[model samples]
Target: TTTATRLTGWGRTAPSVANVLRTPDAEMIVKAVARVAESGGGRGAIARGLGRSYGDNAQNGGGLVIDMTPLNTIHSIDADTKLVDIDAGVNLDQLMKAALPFGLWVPVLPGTRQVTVGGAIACDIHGKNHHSAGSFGNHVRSMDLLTADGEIRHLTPTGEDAELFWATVGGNGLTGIIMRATIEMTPTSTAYFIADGDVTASLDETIALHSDGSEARYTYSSAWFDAISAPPKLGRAAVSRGRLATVEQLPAKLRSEPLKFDTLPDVFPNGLANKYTFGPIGELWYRKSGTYRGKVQNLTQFYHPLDMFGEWAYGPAGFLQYQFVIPTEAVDEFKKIIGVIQASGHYSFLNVFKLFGPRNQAPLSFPIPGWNICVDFPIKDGLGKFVSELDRRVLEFGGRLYTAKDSRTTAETFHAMYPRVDEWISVRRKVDPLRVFASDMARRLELL
Candidate 1:
């Protein structure tokens, strides 16, 4: 059964109404797919989970959306085989709670712990460790997918249905809805990490430190740039790194509560910007990090510290996030682009930098072998045109915007950035010939 409902992404931009369908099992998922087509899902049906996408990847205006959270259930974990079968709605936090007790954890964790497995795969999220661990999909062995044809199929990234598998991995819920997965989990000795950072004097020094400091030496690394508030120190940054902590490295007090996690998150504040603009907040963080050279911290502090505040989902005046990756060969151009953005007067409070490893097989995968930057901006009038121009400029340097974080990019610009966009579309057409799976993002960006 389905009902009329309203939904919006985390950014609270482009709210839409849809017929929301929820099912408890894979069979019901197949039925949900059928019901979408029966309802003329050409306006399109898309899968949604937690609605964490900064953009509108999960909402289909005046169409259908199958909520996959009901199907969430952890079947079993095989420590011997290092494999775990779980539903699409199982989030990183859920898996961490269950696996960490057994010295196991998900290989890749995005900045936040609230994203669902299917959402992570659909968005192909990358974390600070992407320079070493790769994206979430790279660790997935296989998945159970429900296509528009109302059929369920088991697929793997490099197996018989390789094409469909790759297409669905980062396909933004357009190829199909992932039902369940057998993912690879990593072993851990402790739930803490040894984290440290160095504050830089200039953007050049920031890049230099990150380039020289980055390698297999650190499991995680990222650079933060806060230039909007300080005019003289434009692009001054802090480069940070984290290595998994072991029992020997853990302090005496932390040894007993190594796996302890804070489940009670802070309630939402009245305003996003005034209360916690990740920009100014991040600048304060940079200063504090500079004072503390190193610290032994829990996984939450090391990977998802910002997640403690619930009000980050929506800002005081709403917000938009822009992330782009340019090849390592374009370093000078990357610096120039940074200056261009600062010159635009839409300078961000929170600018993040990370290194990416080799690109995986996913056709629509966002990460290439290069440098990636994510900046958060308070939404304002005429932001659409500014982002539009930035998109065009980025495309010129072989850079591409992250679909999960973008709300204003055009389909043509998207196509120009992703050469394999057509390849992924071809596979999607085979599974959803009628284009029954759709999203506001799909329609607006013409992803089909």
Candidate 2:
């Protein structure tokens, strides 16, 4: 059964109405896609998982939307090998709770744990450890993909379906619905981190510390760039670095519950931070964050501080998270790009900076060996042209935007950014010749 439903991504900037079908099992999912393929009236169907994409990637306007979250199940966990096979609807938070007792953790974790494993695979999400661990796709050993033809194809990185596998990794659900997947988890002694924090003075110093030799010693590294600062002190950031804490390193009081995993309640309400309030908010954060070393912190505290505020924004104004990456050699261009944002007069409460290591096999994967920055700007007048200027500069500097975070990028700009998009499209066509998989993002970017 289906019902008319309105859907939006985490950013809440765009909304679309669709016939949503809740598929609770593999059989139901196959039936849903098969039915859509036969008489979908050319609008096609796409999967929606957690709806965590900060854009229209998971939404299909005036079309069939398959809600995969109902299929949640953890089929198996091989503790000895640190591999767990789980359903597409299984979220990171659920997986963490199930695997932590066995001393296993997902290799890559984005800013939030609410995202589903299937969604992570579709977006090929990367985290602070991307410099060392790469994106989520790198850890996936195999996937059960339900294609447009209603056949379940087993895909592996080096198998016969290798091309389709890579395409589907970051394919944004265009290739097919990921029914379930097996991911390789990293070994962890406890659910804690030996965290390190440092406050840098300027953009140059921030980059120097991030790219210097010391960063290699840590498994995770990221920085928060204050967007409100003026020149000379511009781009001053609070850097956070950490490695998994050893069980022996745990404090005596916490040793008994070494793997205790918990999350704080959603505390920060929406509409809490605005342009007028963010200046002091950012300054207070920067000024208060002093240098600290080897501080023991919980996983949630260190990795997902903002998770406490679920899908939050300044107000009903909505927002967009624009993330772009340029090669390390184009550092000067990166600085100019940041300066452009500062000059635009559009304020972003969150401006993050991170260093990417190397490109993965996924052609549409966002990260490359470069400098990446993520900015969150509230929806307002002039933002469209402001981001367009950024898109032009990003492409000129051999950079590309993250499709997972994009909402308003033009098709021409997107194509210019991802040169290998054609290869991804070709593979997608092979699996979905009728273009049965579609989304607002796919239609807008001409991906289908």
Candidate 3:
């Protein structure tokens, strides 16, 4: 069934209209694409997963939007080989529940576990463990892509269609709709992390700690900076680092249900994060997380503490997440950018800073070997010009913003950020010459 529906990204900004069709299985998806190609008023189509992308990556304004959530299924799990075959619609939360009991864990997870496998691959989602594990697409062994011609192509990392495979990894569903995938899972003795925390007096201290390899043994590492603070206390932050807990590490009570995982609602709406409230909130957050070590934390506590908060964090007005990465040598420039944000008067409730280890083969992948800073600023006047200037600075320092988190960036800036985009475009055009797959993001970024 199809219906004209208005949709917006998770950021809740820039709503658009589309003909949405919910396909329960691969057969319906194939037919729907074929139907659009045959006679669809000349409009293109794009796949919509759980719609977790902060931008319009899944929305096809005035065209067809394929909702693939109905195809949720975990086909098989080979514990011996640590391999699991699953439908693209199967989300990480669902997969974790089924795989945890078998002593396996999904290799990569973003801030939340609610994302679908297809969405994760399209975005090439990364987690706190990105330095060690890479992105979600890195763990995917192979995938079944439903192309514009209504033909299913099996893509492997090193196959004849390897170029297409890499393009699709972080391609934002521009190449095709992922129907199924085979992923390699990491073995785990328990669903717990041996975590630690450190409160830094300044951004330099945080970066130095992350660089000195003091906590390098831990598989996951990240820091939360207070963006509203002034000069001397500027960039004060709380650093978090952790690794998977072993069976012996778990207490007697937890050992009984080692793999057990549970999530609960912990809502904190965006309204509470206004300038007036965030100051004290951030101070307490930083103070409470003083120096600590070897705390046994669950998956929810260590990896996705925000998942339980629901979507209330982003208010109706919506917000923009400006995430960019600069080379290690550009630390001085990066610090200057932080000074700009501090003086901008825009209060960012959450400012995440981390070190990315290396870049993958995917042309559009956001991470590079250096520092990454992500800030969430609510929508307001003059914000566009402010970020536009930030974009210029980032580009000047050889940095780029994350596409999946972008909602209002120019095609020119995007091209400048991703020079290898031409290579990705060539692959996309070869398979989708008719431009059968399209999205508002694609049109806006000139990907189609």
Enumerate residue pairs that collide in model 1.
41-44, 279-349
Count backbone overlaps in model 1: 2
The total of clashing pairs for model 2 equals: 0
Q: Mind giving the per-residue lDDT tens digits that candidate 3 earns over 17-50?
A: 9999986857888998888767734669999989
| TM-score of every candidate | 0.90, 0.93, 0.93
- Per-residue lDDT over 110-152 for candidate 2, one digit per residue giving the tens place of the 0 to 100 score: 9878899989999999999999999999999999999999999
The lDDT for every candidate, in the order shown, is: 0.81, 0.87, 0.87
Model 3 CA deviation exceeding 4 Å by range: 39-41, 263-288, 307-316
Quick one: best lDDT, which candidate?
A: 2
Q: Which ten residues in a row have the lowest lDDT in candidate 3?
A: 263-272
TM-score of 3: 0.93
lDDT of 2 at 411: 96
Candidate order by lDDT, highest to lowest? 2, 3, 1
1 versus 3: better lDDT goes to: 3
Candidate 3: clashing pairs of residues: none
268-294 in candidate 1: lDDT tens per residue?
344434544456776676567574545
Clashing pairs in 2: none
